[PDB]
């Protein structure tokens, strides 16, 4: 199928407590493969998947140099943004950055992205054409103008269309056992009385990969949203994911409801019924 490589960076100012926190993590699809944490002992980019551990010392030396460069830019950015919004030195603020590339089933470039956020909301993003920028407010228009005048997008587009795709293909090959896999959900349903008039039906999906899944409830075939409770898809901790969805139903009408499971590991979608 299609695949992605994404890097996630979080920078948090610590007023009166010294240097900002900086955390970088890299993913291929839903699998993490590297990390850097400013507060950890190594001060190096570190492996977090078996298939990246085989990269040699030039890899780890270069990624450590580059992730430190990312850290240094984010440290200056916090001060710049505090100025742009005329904020006091007393409060903590957050910068987040995400960039990466998608490839299709042919492993050819599909799309690239680079998004930046300040205090939890969009600040500036690269447009889908990878040639100019979308500013979220008037302060970010200052950055848009500066980055467009300086042609910043050109080097980034070359990275997203080139380097990013080439190294994603390398990782997919080297980690094929882990990354080129689908684990279909293991499914079941539980029943619990709520009162002498109502019962909870809970549809479960366990041990699946990748994380994308859809659980939906129907009554007599009609989509059901009245009472549907859905939890966020969650990690099991072994490389797979879990999710459930529940409906509260009148006692004795259980057989009218069906739970429908869609996942790329399933040849056909599943339908579960309390019976």
């Amino acid at each position: 199928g299609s695949h992605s490589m994404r890097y996630f960076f979080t920078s948090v100012s610590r007023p009166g407590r010294g240097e900002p926190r900086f955390i970088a993590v890299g993913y291929v699809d839903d699998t993490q493969f590297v990390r850097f944490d400013s507060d950890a002992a190594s001060q190096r980019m570190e492996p977090r998947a078996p298939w990246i551990e085989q990269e040699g010392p030039e890899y780890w030396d270069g990624e450590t140099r580059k992730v430190k460069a990312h850290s240094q830019t984010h440290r200056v950015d916090l001060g710049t943004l505090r100025g742009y919004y005329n904020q006091s030195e007393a409060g903590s603020h957050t910068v987040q950055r995400m960039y990466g590339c998608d490839v299709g089933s042919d492993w050819r470039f599909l799309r690239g992205y680079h998004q930046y956020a300040y205090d939890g909301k969009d600040y500036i993003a690269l447009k889908e054409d990878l040639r100019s920028w979308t500013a979220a407010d008037m302060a970010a228009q200052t950055t848009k103008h500066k980055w467009e005048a300086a042609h910043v997008a050109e080097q980034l587009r070359a990275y997203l269309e080139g380097t990013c795709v080439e190294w994603l293909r390398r990782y997919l090959e080297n980690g094929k056992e882990t990354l080129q896999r689908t684990d279909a959900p293991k499914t079941h349903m539980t029943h619990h009385a709520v009162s002498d008039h109502e019962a909870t039906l809970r549809c479960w999906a366990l041990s699946f990969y990748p994380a994308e899944i859809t659980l939906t409830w129907q009554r007599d075939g009609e989509d059901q949203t009245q009472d549907t409770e859905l939890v966020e898809t969650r990690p099991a901790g072994d490389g797979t994911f879990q999710k459930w969805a529940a409906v509260v139903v009148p006692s004795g009408q259980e057989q009218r409801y069906t739970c429908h499971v869609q996942h790329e590991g399933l040849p056909k979608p599943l339908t579960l019924r309390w019976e």
Binding site: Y7, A24, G26, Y59, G62, E63, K66, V67, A69, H70, T73, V76, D77, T80, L81, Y84, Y99, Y116, T143, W147, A150, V152, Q155, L156, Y159, T163, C164, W167
Partner: peptide
């Protein structure tokens, strides 16, 4: 791998 150029705001 990471991008090698990271321009400041």
């Amino acid at each position: 791998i990471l991008n090698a150029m990271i321009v400041k705001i």
